[PDB]
Protein backbone atom coordinates (compact mmCIF):
# COMPACT_ATOMS: atom_id res chain seq x y z
CA UNK A 1 0.00 0.00 0.00
CA UNK A 2 1.02 3.63 -0.50
CA UNK A 3 0.51 3.90 3.26
CA UNK A 4 3.61 3.96 5.45
CA UNK A 5 1.66 3.94 8.74
CA UNK A 6 -1.89 2.63 9.20
CA UNK A 7 -4.08 1.89 12.20
CA UNK A 8 -7.56 0.40 12.18
CA UNK A 9 -10.82 1.02 14.02
CA UNK A 10 -14.20 -0.65 14.48
CA UNK A 11 -17.50 1.12 13.86
CA UNK A 12 -20.86 -0.30 14.93
CA UNK A 13 -24.33 1.22 14.68
CA UNK A 14 -26.23 1.83 17.92
CA UNK A 15 -29.98 1.99 17.52
CA UNK A 16 -31.56 2.53 14.14
CA UNK A 17 -29.83 4.38 11.33
CA UNK A 18 -30.49 8.12 11.76
CA UNK A 19 -29.90 8.74 8.04
CA UNK A 20 -26.16 9.50 8.07
CA UNK A 21 -23.04 7.45 8.76
CA UNK A 22 -20.25 8.93 10.89
CA UNK A 23 -16.63 7.86 11.41
CA UNK A 24 -13.94 9.68 13.41
CA UNK A 25 -10.22 9.74 12.55
CA UNK A 26 -8.25 11.36 15.41
CA UNK A 27 -4.62 10.42 14.78
CA UNK A 28 -3.76 12.24 11.54
CA UNK A 29 -0.95 14.75 12.22
CA UNK A 30 -1.95 18.43 12.11
CA UNK A 31 1.32 20.26 12.66
CA UNK A 32 1.19 23.23 15.06
CA UNK A 33 2.53 26.76 14.51
CA UNK A 34 2.35 26.19 10.75
CA UNK A 35 -0.15 28.41 8.93
CA UNK A 36 1.15 27.00 5.62
CA UNK A 37 0.85 23.24 6.26
CA UNK A 38 -1.66 21.45 4.02
CA UNK A 39 -2.70 17.85 3.39
CA UNK A 40 -3.96 15.73 0.50
CA UNK A 41 -6.85 13.51 1.60
CA UNK A 42 -8.55 10.84 -0.48
CA UNK A 43 -11.20 8.43 0.74
CA UNK A 44 -12.11 4.98 -0.57
CA UNK A 45 -15.30 3.27 0.59
CA UNK A 46 -15.54 -0.46 0.05
CA UNK A 47 -18.96 -2.04 -0.47
CA UNK A 48 -20.35 -5.43 -1.53
CA UNK A 49 -23.23 -5.21 -4.08
CA UNK A 50 -24.27 -8.84 -4.51
CA UNK A 51 -21.45 -10.45 -2.62
CA UNK A 52 -19.20 -8.91 -5.28
CA UNK A 53 -16.74 -6.11 -4.51
CA UNK A 54 -17.24 -2.48 -5.50
CA UNK A 55 -15.05 0.50 -4.57
CA UNK A 56 -16.00 4.18 -4.51
CA UNK A 57 -13.01 6.53 -4.77
CA UNK A 58 -13.36 10.15 -3.53
CA UNK A 59 -10.84 13.05 -3.47
CA UNK A 60 -11.36 15.99 -1.04
CA UNK A 61 -8.28 17.76 -2.50
CA UNK A 62 -6.03 19.91 -0.30
CA UNK A 63 -6.96 20.66 3.30
CA UNK A 64 -6.41 24.17 4.70
CA UNK A 65 -7.10 23.81 8.44
CA UNK A 66 -6.19 27.44 9.12
CA UNK A 67 -9.01 28.67 6.85
CA UNK A 68 -11.54 25.94 5.98
CA UNK A 69 -13.19 23.41 8.30
CA UNK A 70 -15.86 21.68 6.15
CA UNK A 71 -14.98 19.87 2.93
CA UNK A 72 -16.84 18.15 0.11
CA UNK A 73 -15.21 15.74 -2.36
CA UNK A 74 -14.03 17.26 -5.62
CA UNK A 75 -14.54 14.07 -7.62
CA UNK A 76 -16.07 10.62 -7.30
CA UNK A 77 -14.89 7.59 -9.32
CA UNK A 78 -16.82 4.65 -7.88
CA UNK A 79 -19.59 6.95 -9.08
CA UNK A 80 -23.19 7.80 -8.15
CA UNK A 81 -26.04 9.76 -9.73
CA UNK A 82 -24.54 12.48 -7.45
CA UNK A 83 -21.90 10.99 -5.13
CA UNK A 84 -20.06 14.20 -4.02
CA UNK A 85 -23.09 15.91 -2.37
CA UNK A 86 -23.71 12.95 0.01
CA UNK A 87 -20.22 13.12 1.66
CA UNK A 88 -18.63 15.50 4.22
CA UNK A 89 -15.17 15.72 5.78
CA UNK A 90 -15.25 17.90 8.90
CA UNK A 91 -12.41 18.91 11.19
CA UNK A 92 -13.28 18.54 14.88
CA UNK A 93 -10.25 20.27 16.38
CA UNK A 94 -7.09 19.02 18.09
CA UNK A 95 -5.98 17.13 15.00
CA UNK A 96 -9.25 15.20 14.73
CA UNK A 97 -11.49 14.90 11.68
CA UNK A 98 -14.83 13.23 10.99
CA UNK A 99 -16.09 11.72 7.74
CA UNK A 100 -19.86 11.66 7.23
CA UNK A 101 -21.87 9.79 4.60
CA UNK A 102 -25.61 10.11 4.05
CA UNK A 103 -27.18 6.67 4.34
CA UNK A 104 -30.65 5.94 2.89
CA UNK A 105 -29.29 6.99 -0.53
CA UNK A 106 -27.15 5.08 -3.01
CA UNK A 107 -23.61 6.47 -3.52
CA UNK A 108 -22.57 3.59 -5.80
CA UNK A 109 -22.63 4.09 -9.58
CA UNK A 110 -23.29 0.55 -10.82
CA UNK A 111 -26.68 -1.01 -10.08
CA UNK A 112 -28.26 -4.06 -11.79
CA UNK A 113 -31.50 -2.47 -10.50
CA UNK A 114 -32.30 -5.87 -8.99
CA UNK A 115 -29.86 -5.14 -6.11
CA UNK A 116 -31.39 -2.01 -4.52
CA UNK A 117 -29.60 -3.74 -1.61
CA UNK A 118 -26.02 -2.56 -0.79
CA UNK A 119 -23.77 -3.05 2.27
CA UNK A 120 -20.88 -0.96 3.61
CA UNK A 121 -17.83 -3.07 4.46
CA UNK A 122 -14.97 -0.70 5.34
CA UNK A 123 -13.64 2.83 4.80
CA UNK A 124 -10.06 3.78 3.87
CA UNK A 125 -8.84 7.34 4.48
CA UNK A 126 -5.56 8.49 2.91
CA UNK A 127 -3.65 11.41 4.46
CA UNK A 128 -0.55 12.94 2.83
CA UNK A 129 1.18 15.78 4.68
CA UNK A 130 3.78 18.41 3.77
CA UNK A 131 6.61 15.91 4.35
CA UNK A 132 5.04 13.52 1.82
CA UNK A 133 4.41 10.67 4.27
CA UNK A 134 1.25 8.68 3.53
CA UNK A 135 -0.94 8.15 6.60
CA UNK A 136 -3.90 5.77 6.41
CA UNK A 137 -6.84 4.76 8.58
CA UNK A 138 -8.96 1.63 8.06
CA UNK A 139 -12.47 1.69 9.54
CA UNK A 140 -14.03 -1.77 9.55
CA UNK A 141 -17.82 -1.98 10.00
CA UNK A 142 -18.55 -4.49 12.80
CA UNK A 143 -21.88 -5.49 11.16
CA UNK A 144 -22.44 -4.99 7.38
CA UNK A 145 -24.97 -2.12 6.99
CA UNK A 146 -27.21 -3.36 4.10
CA UNK A 147 -28.40 0.27 3.55
CA UNK A 148 -31.89 0.85 1.99
CA UNK A 149 -32.53 3.86 -0.33
CA UNK A 150 -35.45 5.96 0.90
CA UNK A 151 -37.01 9.40 1.30
CA UNK A 152 -38.23 9.84 4.89
CA UNK A 153 -41.00 12.43 5.35
CA UNK A 154 -40.15 15.54 7.35
CA UNK A 155 -42.72 16.05 10.11
CA UNK A 156 -43.13 18.82 12.67
CA UNK A 157 -44.47 18.31 16.20
CA UNK A 158 -46.58 21.44 16.01
CA UNK A 159 -47.72 21.38 19.65
CA UNK A 160 -44.42 21.86 21.54
CA UNK A 161 -43.25 25.13 23.14
CA UNK A 162 -40.94 27.38 21.08
CA UNK A 163 -37.85 28.65 22.95
CA UNK A 164 -36.05 31.94 22.22
CA UNK A 165 -32.87 30.04 23.22
CA UNK A 166 -31.16 28.54 20.14
CA UNK A 167 -29.12 25.32 20.05
CA UNK A 168 -25.68 25.73 18.47
CA UNK A 169 -23.68 22.70 17.33
CA UNK A 170 -19.94 22.94 16.68
CA UNK A 171 -17.66 20.15 15.40
CA UNK A 172 -20.71 17.84 15.43
CA UNK A 173 -21.33 18.60 19.12
CA UNK A 174 -24.64 20.26 20.04
CA UNK A 175 -24.84 22.39 23.19
CA UNK A 176 -28.03 24.01 24.51
CA UNK A 177 -29.54 25.13 27.83
CA UNK A 178 -33.28 25.23 28.52
CA UNK A 179 -35.28 26.40 31.61
CA UNK A 180 -37.69 24.01 33.42
CA UNK A 181 -41.50 24.17 33.02
CA UNK A 182 -42.16 21.22 35.38
CA UNK A 183 -45.06 21.45 37.91
CA UNK A 184 -43.95 18.45 40.05
CA UNK A 185 -41.58 19.31 42.94
CA UNK A 186 -37.87 18.38 42.65
CA UNK A 187 -38.32 15.84 45.49
CA UNK A 188 -40.96 14.08 43.31
CA UNK A 189 -38.21 13.73 40.65
CA UNK A 190 -38.94 10.75 38.31
CA UNK A 191 -38.01 13.18 35.53
CA UNK A 192 -37.36 11.73 32.07
CA UNK A 193 -36.30 13.61 28.93
CA UNK A 194 -36.16 12.44 25.31
CA UNK A 195 -34.66 14.46 22.45
CA UNK A 196 -35.32 14.33 18.71
CA UNK A 197 -33.45 16.26 16.00
CA UNK A 198 -35.38 16.39 12.72
CA UNK A 199 -34.48 17.98 9.41
CA UNK A 200 -33.43 17.36 5.80
CA UNK A 201 -34.37 13.67 5.63
CA UNK A 202 -32.59 12.54 8.82
CA UNK A 203 -33.92 12.06 12.37
CA UNK A 204 -31.83 11.61 15.55
CA UNK A 205 -33.21 10.07 18.75
CA UNK A 206 -31.44 10.35 22.10
CA UNK A 207 -32.44 8.65 25.36
CA UNK A 208 -31.23 7.90 28.88
CA UNK A 209 -28.77 5.03 29.23
CA UNK A 210 -29.97 4.37 32.80
CA UNK A 211 -33.56 5.60 32.43
CA UNK A 212 -35.23 8.10 34.72
CA UNK A 213 -33.12 9.24 37.69
CA UNK A 214 -36.16 9.38 40.07
CA UNK A 215 -33.89 11.49 42.34
CA UNK A 216 -33.47 15.28 41.88
CA UNK A 217 -30.47 16.98 43.53
CA UNK A 218 -30.39 20.80 44.04
CA UNK A 219 -26.78 20.07 43.06
CA UNK A 220 -26.52 18.98 39.42
CA UNK A 221 -27.43 15.25 38.93
CA UNK A 222 -25.77 14.26 35.60
CA UNK A 223 -27.04 11.61 33.16
CA UNK A 224 -25.52 9.86 30.12
CA UNK A 225 -27.50 9.89 26.87
CA UNK A 226 -27.30 7.51 23.91
CA UNK A 227 -28.20 8.89 20.47
CA UNK A 228 -29.29 6.77 17.52
CA UNK A 229 -26.41 6.67 15.07
CA UNK A 230 -22.69 5.87 15.13
CA UNK A 231 -21.77 7.15 18.62
CA UNK A 232 -18.68 9.45 18.85
CA UNK A 233 -15.74 8.85 21.25
CA UNK A 234 -16.75 12.15 22.96
CA UNK A 235 -19.26 11.13 25.72
CA UNK A 236 -22.70 12.61 25.11
CA UNK A 237 -24.88 13.59 28.03
CA UNK A 238 -26.77 16.30 29.82
CA UNK A 239 -27.73 17.70 33.20
CA UNK A 240 -30.88 19.03 34.86
CA UNK A 241 -30.34 21.44 37.77
CA UNK A 242 -32.96 22.39 40.34
CA UNK A 243 -33.88 26.07 40.31
CA UNK A 244 -32.42 24.24 34.01
CA UNK A 245 -31.51 21.46 31.56
CA UNK A 246 -28.37 21.31 29.41
CA UNK A 247 -27.85 18.71 26.67
CA UNK A 248 -24.86 17.62 24.57
CA UNK A 249 -25.85 15.03 21.94
CA UNK A 250 -22.66 14.21 20.06
CA UNK A 251 -23.60 12.74 16.62
CA UNK A 252 -25.28 15.94 15.35
CA UNK A 253 -24.40 16.27 11.66
CA UNK A 254 -24.49 19.17 9.20
CA UNK A 255 -26.66 17.10 6.84
CA UNK A 256 -29.61 18.18 9.01
CA UNK A 257 -29.22 21.54 7.25
CA UNK A 258 -30.16 24.94 8.58
CA UNK A 259 -33.44 25.69 10.40
CA UNK A 260 -33.75 22.11 11.68
CA UNK A 261 -35.55 21.65 15.00
CA UNK A 262 -34.50 19.97 18.24
CA UNK A 263 -37.50 18.61 20.16
CA UNK A 264 -37.13 17.95 23.90
CA UNK A 265 -39.83 15.73 25.42
CA UNK A 266 -39.88 15.61 29.22
CA UNK A 267 -42.17 14.29 31.93
CA UNK A 268 -42.74 14.04 35.66
CA UNK A 269 -50.28 11.66 33.32
CA UNK A 270 -48.52 14.96 32.64
CA UNK A 271 -46.03 15.29 29.79
CA UNK A 272 -44.30 18.23 28.12
CA UNK A 273 -42.30 19.06 25.00
CA UNK A 274 -39.98 21.97 24.16
CA UNK A 275 -38.77 22.62 20.60
CA UNK A 276 -35.69 24.66 19.70
CA UNK A 277 -34.09 25.65 16.41
CA UNK A 278 -30.53 24.46 15.77
CA UNK A 279 -27.77 26.24 13.82
CA UNK A 280 -24.48 24.77 12.59
CA UNK A 281 -21.56 27.03 13.44
CA UNK A 282 -18.88 27.21 10.75
CA UNK A 283 -15.96 28.08 13.05
CA UNK A 284 -13.76 25.35 14.52
CA UNK A 285 -14.38 25.04 18.30
CA UNK A 286 -10.65 25.02 19.08
CA UNK A 287 -7.29 25.01 17.32
CA UNK A 288 -7.01 22.25 14.72
CA UNK A 289 -3.37 21.80 15.74
CA UNK A 290 -2.57 18.45 17.29
CA UNK A 291 -1.64 18.56 21.00
CA UNK A 292 2.08 19.25 21.36
CA UNK A 293 4.24 19.21 24.47
CA UNK A 294 6.84 21.93 24.92
CA UNK A 295 10.38 21.20 26.12
CA UNK A 296 13.22 23.61 26.89
CA UNK A 297 16.74 22.69 25.73
CA UNK A 298 19.51 25.15 26.61
CA UNK A 299 22.75 25.56 24.63
CA UNK A 300 25.72 27.70 25.83
CA UNK A 301 27.38 27.01 22.42
CA UNK A 302 26.04 27.31 18.84
CA UNK A 303 25.77 23.49 18.55
CA UNK A 304 22.68 22.09 20.41
CA UNK A 305 21.17 18.61 20.75
CA UNK A 306 17.81 17.06 21.62
CA UNK A 307 16.88 13.40 22.09
CA UNK A 308 13.61 12.10 20.63
CA UNK A 309 12.54 9.11 22.77
CA UNK A 310 10.55 6.12 21.57
CA UNK A 311 7.06 7.13 20.55
CA UNK A 312 4.19 6.61 23.04
CA UNK A 313 5.91 3.44 24.43
CA UNK A 314 4.36 1.36 21.60
CA UNK A 315 6.06 -0.84 19.00
CA UNK A 316 9.51 -0.95 20.47
CA UNK A 317 11.91 -2.28 17.79
CA UNK A 318 9.40 -1.23 15.12
CA UNK A 319 9.71 -2.08 11.41
CA UNK A 320 9.05 1.54 10.36
CA UNK A 321 10.13 4.63 12.31
CA UNK A 322 9.74 8.16 10.92
CA UNK A 323 11.02 11.39 12.51
CA UNK A 324 10.25 14.85 11.11
CA UNK A 325 11.47 18.31 12.10
CA UNK A 326 10.85 21.85 10.91
CA UNK A 327 11.19 25.41 12.16
CA UNK A 328 8.34 27.29 13.80
CA UNK A 329 6.12 29.34 11.49
CA UNK A 330 7.60 28.25 8.14
CA UNK A 331 6.83 30.38 5.09
CA UNK A 332 7.86 28.21 2.10
CA UNK A 333 6.50 24.71 1.48
CA UNK A 334 9.16 23.95 -1.14
CA UNK A 335 12.14 24.11 1.26
CA UNK A 336 11.07 24.09 4.94
CA UNK A 337 9.88 20.46 5.11
CA UNK A 338 12.89 18.41 3.98
CA UNK A 339 14.14 17.25 7.41
CA UNK A 340 12.70 13.73 7.45
CA UNK A 341 14.44 10.58 8.68
CA UNK A 342 13.66 6.86 8.61
CA UNK A 343 15.55 3.73 9.63
CA UNK A 344 16.47 3.02 6.00
CA UNK A 345 16.66 6.66 4.89
CA UNK A 346 20.03 8.34 5.26
CA UNK A 347 20.81 12.05 5.53
CA UNK A 348 18.03 14.07 3.84
CA UNK A 349 19.08 16.29 0.95
CA UNK A 350 17.37 19.61 1.63
CA UNK A 351 17.78 19.57 5.43
CA UNK A 352 20.14 22.43 6.31
CA UNK A 353 22.07 22.67 9.60
CA UNK A 354 20.10 19.82 11.20
CA UNK A 355 21.45 16.27 11.58
CA UNK A 356 19.96 13.15 13.12
CA UNK A 357 20.74 9.47 13.58
CA UNK A 358 19.07 6.50 15.26
CA UNK A 359 21.15 5.46 18.27
CA UNK A 360 20.66 1.95 19.73
CA UNK A 361 17.18 1.71 21.42
CA UNK A 362 16.06 4.11 18.60
CA UNK A 363 16.81 7.19 20.75
CA UNK A 364 16.85 9.56 17.78
CA UNK A 365 19.37 12.30 18.53
CA UNK A 366 19.01 15.55 16.56
CA UNK A 367 21.91 17.99 16.22
CA UNK A 368 20.28 21.36 15.53
CA UNK A 369 23.65 23.11 15.49
CA UNK A 370 23.78 26.22 13.32
CA UNK A 371 21.54 28.57 15.27
CA UNK A 372 22.63 31.32 17.62
CA UNK A 373 21.51 34.31 19.71
CA UNK A 374 17.83 33.66 18.90
CA UNK A 375 15.26 31.61 20.85
CA UNK A 376 13.85 29.35 18.13
CA UNK A 377 11.35 26.49 18.29
CA UNK A 378 11.81 23.18 16.45
CA UNK A 379 8.72 21.04 15.85
CA UNK A 380 9.74 17.39 16.03
CA UNK A 381 7.26 14.64 15.12
CA UNK A 382 7.99 10.93 15.53
CA UNK A 383 5.94 7.87 14.61
CA UNK A 384 6.14 4.10 14.24
CA UNK A 385 3.95 1.24 13.00
CA UNK A 386 0.93 0.79 15.34
CA UNK A 387 2.37 3.58 17.54
CA UNK A 388 0.47 6.83 18.05
CA UNK A 389 2.23 9.91 16.68
CA UNK A 390 3.71 12.50 19.04
CA UNK A 391 4.93 16.01 18.25
CA UNK A 392 7.40 17.91 20.43
CA UNK A 393 7.83 21.67 20.71
CA UNK A 394 11.55 22.03 21.45
CA UNK A 395 12.70 25.57 22.29
CA UNK A 396 16.42 26.26 21.92
CA UNK A 397 17.60 29.09 24.18
CA UNK A 398 21.16 30.36 24.55
CA UNK A 399 22.83 29.93 27.95
CA UNK A 400 25.58 32.30 29.16
CA UNK A 401 27.94 29.69 30.60
CA UNK A 402 28.34 26.02 31.45
CA UNK A 403 27.56 24.39 34.83
CA UNK A 404 25.22 27.35 35.66
Amino acid sequence: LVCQYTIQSLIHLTGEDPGFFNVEIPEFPFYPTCNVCTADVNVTINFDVGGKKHQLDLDFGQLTPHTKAVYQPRGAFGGSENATNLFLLELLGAGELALTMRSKKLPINVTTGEEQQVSLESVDVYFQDVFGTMWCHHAEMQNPVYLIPETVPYIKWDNCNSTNITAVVRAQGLDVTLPLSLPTSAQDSNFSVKTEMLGNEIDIECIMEDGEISQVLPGDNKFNITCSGYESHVPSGGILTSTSLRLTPRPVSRFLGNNSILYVFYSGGGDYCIQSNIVFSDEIPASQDMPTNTTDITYVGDNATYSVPMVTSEDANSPNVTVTAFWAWPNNTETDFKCKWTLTSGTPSGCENISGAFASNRTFDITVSGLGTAPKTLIITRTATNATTTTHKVIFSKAPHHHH
Epitope: E150, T151, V152, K194
Partner: antibody, heavy 120, light 112 residues
Framework: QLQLQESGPGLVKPSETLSLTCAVS????????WSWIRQPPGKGPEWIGF????????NYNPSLKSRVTLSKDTSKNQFSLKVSSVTAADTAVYYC?????????????WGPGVLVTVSS | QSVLTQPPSVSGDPGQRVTISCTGS?????????VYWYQQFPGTAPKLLIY???KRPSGVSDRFSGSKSGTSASLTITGLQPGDEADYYC???????????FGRGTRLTVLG
Protein backbone atom coordinates in the same frame (compact mmCIF):
# COMPACT_ATOMS: atom_id res chain seq x y z
CA GLN B 1 -55.83 -9.30 18.15
CA LEU B 2 -55.54 -5.58 18.81
CA GLN B 3 -58.89 -3.92 18.10
CA LEU B 4 -59.98 -0.28 17.78
CA GLN B 5 -63.50 0.96 18.57
CA GLU B 6 -64.63 4.50 17.74
CA SER B 7 -67.41 6.18 19.70
CA GLY B 8 -69.16 9.52 19.52
CA PRO B 9 -72.28 11.40 18.47
CA GLY B 10 -73.74 10.65 15.07
CA LEU B 11 -75.25 14.10 14.48
CA VAL B 12 -73.59 17.49 15.09
CA LYS B 13 -75.03 20.90 14.22
CA PRO B 14 -73.00 23.28 12.03
CA SER B 15 -70.37 25.45 13.78
CA GLU B 16 -70.36 23.14 16.85
CA THR B 17 -67.45 20.91 17.93
CA LEU B 18 -67.26 17.29 16.82
CA SER B 19 -65.75 14.95 19.42
CA LEU B 20 -64.93 11.23 19.19
CA THR B 21 -62.98 8.66 21.17
CA CYS B 22 -61.13 5.54 20.02
CA ALA B 23 -60.80 2.65 22.47
CA VAL B 24 -57.86 0.27 22.00
CA SER B 25 -58.07 -3.26 23.42
CA UNK B 26 -55.72 -6.20 23.10
CA UNK B 27 -52.78 -3.80 22.76
CA UNK B 28 -51.13 -0.80 24.38
CA UNK B 29 -51.16 2.85 23.36
CA UNK B 30 -47.48 3.01 24.35
CA UNK B 31 -44.92 1.89 21.79
CA UNK B 32 -47.01 2.93 18.77
CA UNK B 33 -48.54 5.98 17.10
CA TRP B 34 -52.25 6.60 16.60
CA SER B 35 -53.96 8.46 13.76
CA TRP B 36 -57.41 9.62 12.62
CA ILE B 37 -58.64 9.24 9.03
CA ARG B 38 -62.01 10.41 7.73
CA GLN B 39 -63.80 9.34 4.54
CA PRO B 40 -66.92 11.12 3.25
CA PRO B 41 -69.31 8.80 1.38
CA GLY B 42 -68.45 8.36 -2.29
CA LYS B 43 -64.97 9.89 -1.86
CA GLY B 44 -61.55 8.68 -0.76
CA PRO B 45 -59.94 8.78 2.67
CA GLU B 46 -58.51 12.00 4.08
CA TRP B 47 -55.77 12.08 6.70
CA ILE B 48 -56.27 14.27 9.78
CA GLY B 49 -53.30 13.69 12.09
CA PHE B 50 -51.63 11.38 14.55
CA UNK B 51 -50.55 11.38 18.20
CA UNK B 52 -47.43 9.84 19.73
CA UNK B 53 -48.17 6.99 22.11
CA UNK B 54 -45.31 7.87 24.47
CA UNK B 55 -45.11 11.69 24.27
CA UNK B 56 -47.34 14.74 23.78
CA UNK B 57 -46.26 14.89 20.14
CA UNK B 58 -49.01 15.66 17.64
CA ASN B 59 -48.88 16.22 13.90
CA TYR B 60 -51.84 17.64 11.99
CA ASN B 61 -52.89 17.97 8.38
CA PRO B 62 -52.17 21.65 7.61
CA SER B 63 -55.52 21.90 5.82
CA LEU B 64 -57.21 21.20 9.19
CA LYS B 65 -54.63 22.36 11.77
CA SER B 66 -56.80 25.31 12.84
CA ARG B 67 -59.80 23.26 14.01
CA VAL B 68 -58.49 19.81 15.02
CA THR B 69 -57.07 18.69 18.37
CA LEU B 70 -55.76 15.20 19.16
CA SER B 71 -55.41 13.87 22.70
CA LYS B 72 -54.72 10.56 24.39
CA ASP B 73 -55.33 8.92 27.76
CA THR B 74 -52.69 6.27 28.47
CA SER B 75 -54.93 5.10 31.27
CA LYS B 76 -58.22 3.74 29.86
CA ASN B 77 -56.10 2.80 26.80
CA GLN B 78 -57.70 5.32 24.47
CA PHE B 79 -57.10 8.45 22.39
CA SER B 80 -59.59 11.07 21.24
CA LEU B 81 -60.32 13.61 18.51
CA LYS B 82 -62.00 17.02 18.32
CA VAL B 83 -63.04 19.10 15.30
CA SER B 84 -64.21 22.71 15.63
CA SER B 85 -66.55 24.79 13.45
CA VAL B 86 -67.88 21.73 11.66
CA THR B 87 -69.54 22.26 8.27
CA ALA B 88 -71.30 20.13 5.67
CA ALA B 89 -67.83 19.27 4.35
CA ASP B 90 -67.01 17.59 7.68
CA THR B 91 -69.69 14.87 7.52
CA ALA B 92 -67.92 11.56 6.94
CA VAL B 93 -67.05 8.19 8.42
CA TYR B 94 -64.28 8.69 10.98
CA TYR B 95 -61.67 5.94 11.37
CA CYS B 96 -59.13 5.58 14.16
CA UNK B 97 -56.06 3.63 13.06
CA UNK B 98 -52.67 2.61 14.42
CA UNK B 99 -49.51 4.09 12.89
CA UNK B 100 -46.97 1.38 13.81
CA UNK B 101 -43.76 3.24 12.89
CA UNK B 102 -42.93 6.95 13.27
CA UNK B 103 -40.62 7.24 10.24
CA UNK B 104 -43.22 5.97 7.75
CA UNK B 105 -46.91 6.80 7.31
CA UNK B 106 -49.07 3.70 6.98
CA UNK B 107 -51.95 2.35 9.04
CA UNK B 108 -52.11 -1.42 9.50
CA UNK B 109 -55.03 -1.80 11.95
CA TRP B 110 -58.18 0.31 11.61
CA GLY B 111 -61.43 0.55 13.51
CA PRO B 112 -64.86 -0.17 12.02
CA GLY B 113 -65.55 3.56 11.76
CA VAL B 114 -68.45 5.72 12.95
CA LEU B 115 -70.52 7.93 10.67
CA VAL B 116 -71.03 11.52 11.81
CA THR B 117 -73.47 13.74 9.93
CA VAL B 118 -73.39 17.54 10.10
CA SER B 119 -76.76 19.14 9.39
CA SER B 120 -79.23 21.62 10.82
CA GLN C 1 -58.52 18.02 -0.91
CA SER C 2 -55.67 17.33 -3.32
CA VAL C 3 -55.74 13.80 -4.73
CA LEU C 4 -53.45 11.37 -6.49
CA THR C 5 -54.67 10.43 -9.97
CA GLN C 6 -56.30 6.99 -10.21
CA PRO C 7 -58.60 5.44 -12.82
CA PRO C 8 -62.21 5.46 -11.56
CA SER C 9 -62.62 1.77 -12.43
CA VAL C 10 -60.77 -1.08 -14.13
CA SER C 11 -62.17 -4.25 -15.69
CA GLY C 12 -60.63 -7.69 -15.92
CA ASP C 13 -61.27 -11.23 -17.11
CA PRO C 14 -61.44 -13.90 -14.38
CA GLY C 15 -58.08 -15.58 -13.87
CA GLN C 16 -56.22 -12.85 -15.77
CA ARG C 17 -54.24 -9.91 -14.38
CA VAL C 18 -55.12 -6.20 -14.30
CA THR C 19 -53.15 -3.08 -13.41
CA ILE C 20 -54.21 -0.05 -11.35
CA SER C 21 -52.11 3.09 -11.82
CA CYS C 22 -51.54 5.77 -9.17
CA THR C 23 -50.07 9.02 -10.51
CA GLY C 24 -48.55 11.78 -8.39
CA SER C 25 -46.09 14.67 -8.74
CA UNK C 26 -42.46 15.40 -7.89
CA UNK C 27 -43.69 16.69 -4.51
CA UNK C 28 -45.11 13.36 -3.30
CA UNK C 29 -44.33 10.29 -5.42
CA UNK C 30 -41.61 11.63 -7.72
CA UNK C 31 -39.54 12.61 -4.69
CA UNK C 32 -39.18 8.92 -3.80
CA UNK C 33 -41.59 8.88 -0.86
CA UNK C 34 -43.13 5.50 -0.18
CA VAL C 35 -46.37 4.30 -1.77
CA TYR C 36 -49.11 2.42 0.08
CA TRP C 37 -52.17 0.55 -1.18
CA TYR C 38 -55.42 -0.09 0.69
CA GLN C 39 -58.27 -2.46 -0.18
CA GLN C 40 -61.79 -1.50 0.93
CA PHE C 41 -64.85 -3.68 0.53
CA PRO C 42 -68.07 -1.63 0.68
CA GLY C 43 -69.17 -0.77 4.21
CA THR C 44 -65.85 -1.74 5.83
CA ALA C 45 -62.66 -0.06 6.97
CA PRO C 46 -59.81 0.08 4.44
CA LYS C 47 -57.37 -2.82 4.71
CA LEU C 48 -53.65 -2.21 4.24
CA LEU C 49 -52.82 -4.09 1.02
CA ILE C 50 -49.26 -3.05 0.05
CA TYR C 51 -46.87 -1.15 2.33
CA UNK C 52 -43.38 0.25 1.60
CA UNK C 53 -43.96 0.35 -2.21
CA UNK C 54 -43.98 -3.46 -2.77
CA LYS C 55 -44.01 -5.22 0.61
CA ARG C 56 -46.84 -7.56 1.57
CA PRO C 57 -48.38 -7.88 5.05
CA SER C 58 -48.68 -11.33 6.57
CA GLY C 59 -52.00 -12.59 5.23
CA VAL C 60 -52.31 -10.66 1.97
CA SER C 61 -52.21 -13.02 -1.00
CA ASP C 62 -49.18 -13.31 -3.27
CA ARG C 63 -51.39 -12.42 -6.26
CA PHE C 64 -51.04 -8.78 -5.11
CA SER C 65 -47.84 -6.88 -5.88
CA GLY C 66 -46.65 -3.30 -6.19
CA SER C 67 -44.39 -1.10 -8.29
CA LYS C 68 -43.22 2.51 -8.00
CA SER C 69 -40.86 3.31 -10.93
CA GLY C 70 -41.14 6.90 -12.14
CA THR C 71 -43.59 9.54 -10.98
CA SER C 72 -46.41 6.98 -10.76
CA ALA C 73 -47.00 3.75 -8.86
CA SER C 74 -48.91 0.62 -9.85
CA LEU C 75 -50.79 -2.21 -8.13
CA THR C 76 -51.05 -5.57 -9.92
CA ILE C 77 -53.65 -8.29 -9.33
CA THR C 78 -52.96 -11.69 -10.91
CA GLY C 79 -55.15 -14.77 -11.08
CA LEU C 80 -58.11 -12.44 -10.79
CA GLN C 81 -60.92 -13.85 -8.62
CA PRO C 82 -64.50 -12.61 -8.17
CA GLY C 83 -63.88 -11.87 -4.49
CA ASP C 84 -61.36 -9.16 -5.41
CA GLU C 85 -64.13 -6.76 -6.48
CA ALA C 86 -63.51 -3.83 -4.12
CA ASP C 87 -62.22 -0.27 -3.82
CA TYR C 88 -58.45 0.20 -4.17
CA TYR C 89 -56.80 3.38 -2.86
CA CYS C 90 -53.16 4.41 -3.15
CA UNK C 91 -51.40 6.58 -0.57
CA UNK C 92 -48.22 8.64 -0.52
CA UNK C 93 -46.83 11.51 1.53
CA UNK C 94 -46.49 14.96 -0.07
CA UNK C 95 -43.61 17.22 0.92
CA UNK C 96 -45.27 20.33 -0.56
CA UNK C 97 -48.46 19.71 1.46
CA UNK C 98 -46.97 18.29 4.70
CA UNK C 99 -49.75 15.69 4.76
CA UNK C 100 -50.63 12.15 3.69
CA UNK C 101 -52.39 12.05 0.32
CA PHE C 102 -54.91 9.48 -0.90
CA GLY C 103 -56.01 8.69 -4.42
CA ARG C 104 -59.39 9.09 -6.08
CA GLY C 105 -59.94 5.33 -5.87
CA THR C 106 -60.61 2.51 -8.32
CA ARG C 107 -63.54 0.09 -8.58
CA LEU C 108 -62.45 -3.41 -9.61
CA THR C 109 -65.05 -5.31 -11.65
CA VAL C 110 -64.74 -8.93 -12.77
CA LEU C 111 -65.87 -9.49 -16.33
CA GLY C 112 -67.90 -12.48 -17.47
Amino acid sequence: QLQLQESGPGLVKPSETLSLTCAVSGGSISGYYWSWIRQPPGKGPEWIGFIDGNTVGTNYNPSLKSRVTLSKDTSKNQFSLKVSSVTAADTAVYYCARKPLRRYFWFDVWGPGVLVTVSS
Amino acid sequence: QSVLTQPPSVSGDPGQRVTISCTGSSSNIGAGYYVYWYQQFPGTAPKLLIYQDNKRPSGVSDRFSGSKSGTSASLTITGLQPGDEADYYCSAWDSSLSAVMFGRGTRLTVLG
